[PDB]
Design a protein around this ligand. Sequence first.
Ligand SMILES: O=c1ccn([C@@H]2O[C@H](COP(=O)(O)OP(=O)(O)O)[C@@H](O)[C@H]2O)c(=O)[nH]1
Ligand SMILES: [Cl-]
Ligand SMILES: [Cl-]
Ligand SMILES: [Cl-]
Length: 453
Amino acid sequence: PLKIYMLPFFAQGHLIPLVNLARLVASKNQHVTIITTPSNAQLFDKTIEEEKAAGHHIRVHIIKFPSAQLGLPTGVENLFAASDNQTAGKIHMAAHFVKADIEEFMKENPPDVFISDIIFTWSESTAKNLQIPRLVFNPISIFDVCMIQAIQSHPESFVSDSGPYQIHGLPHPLTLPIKPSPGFARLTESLIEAENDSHGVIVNSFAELDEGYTEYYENLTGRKVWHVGPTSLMVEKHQSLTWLDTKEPSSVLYISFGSLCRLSNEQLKEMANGIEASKHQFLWVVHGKEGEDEDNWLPKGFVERMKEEKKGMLIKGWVPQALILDHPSIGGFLTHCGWNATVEAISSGVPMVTMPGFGDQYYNEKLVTEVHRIGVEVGAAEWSMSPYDAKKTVVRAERIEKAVKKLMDSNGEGGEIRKRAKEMKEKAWKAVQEGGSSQNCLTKLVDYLHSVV
Ligand SMILES: O=c1ccn([C@@H]2O[C@H](COP(=O)(O)OP(=O)(O)O)[C@@H](O)[C@H]2O)c(=O)[nH]1
Ligand SMILES: [Cl-]
Ligand SMILES: [Cl-]
Ligand SMILES: [Cl-]
């Protein structure tokens, strides 16, 4: 059994995929330690207790979050607790400050293998000075870094002031309506750089989804890709459901952007008009609007006609999203294309209507709509690097209405996309089931680590 230390970054889209990888590797009779901070460990300690109770050798080593060095108040230890770019940048800076406590812990208790999130750039020098193999963990598909690199390597394609823009050199032709904003290629230098006797990159995706981009990346960097994901699938009555029980199969568009990527008042109004003009049934979940005048973010009397024509339901608060996406009445998912939303949509076979909000979501959109055609693209109006900055432009209602109609209408393109989405669901569960690509690759990874030690 190997001694494997796993270092997640302090963000939910990074933390939970790496924790799930930790549960998978522990389930293969390995000694796994997750190194994290107190507020983050309490997001999954109950799962760890259940794994320990099943005989799996998995534990959490607590390190102090550098709140004092950053001037952050206690309990602000992940991006979900940040509310502005300054705080978000400080949490990114925290990845550098934890280096001393982690290096000290590893010089005293050296493990056999060190697995660290892409962000901890110091992990390379730490593994060399301790003479220990290190693998990088990428919590999303390898397609994103490929799209980024293709953009970076073709600056002549983005010289025009107005789009569309062509992305060349990839397995698929890709287009962008808006050019990437300065700094779009952050947190990729560790992934794009060539190999220096690399043990590979662990990728939270599956081979079928990344097909072609796996080879593009390996050819570009020389580094092996280990597809072991989606790890959230590998480790496997609310009034909304009651309303859905009255609707025809695949007849309801589910709309949810969550809390981080919540839309502006002007954007919510454009959305309601486009959704209403689409004439399709909808389940719209909005966060952070309880006790606010609906006229501030909805058209006049939107909710009145919404219930009179029996078209839509608007929920202000938390909904069981996993059960909603599994309900047969849902026929579409309008969302921001975050990785977790993308994986959940795939796992439920639900086609997406893509409206990316910030960051990696513009690349996730293209994987969904232009590579795999398991969703429909609304059309971005602004490229934002941050979820907290207010957008100077808005996605107009006709674009939202046209995209919903394109997916939800029967006689057209939506039938193919709906069928492709159902087939990707089967491919995703097959990859994580017994004998699937990601289960086989996880076994080969652990075997390879044994021969490296
Ligand atoms: O009303 C809600 C909002 C979110 N979620 C779950 O919370 C995660 C997504 O949270 P959120 O959208 O806030 O995260 P973001 O993608 O914006 O970072 C997923 O597992 C969803 O299933 C949920 O169950 N109900
Ligand atoms: Cl996942
Ligand atoms: Cl917005
Ligand atoms: Cl295989």
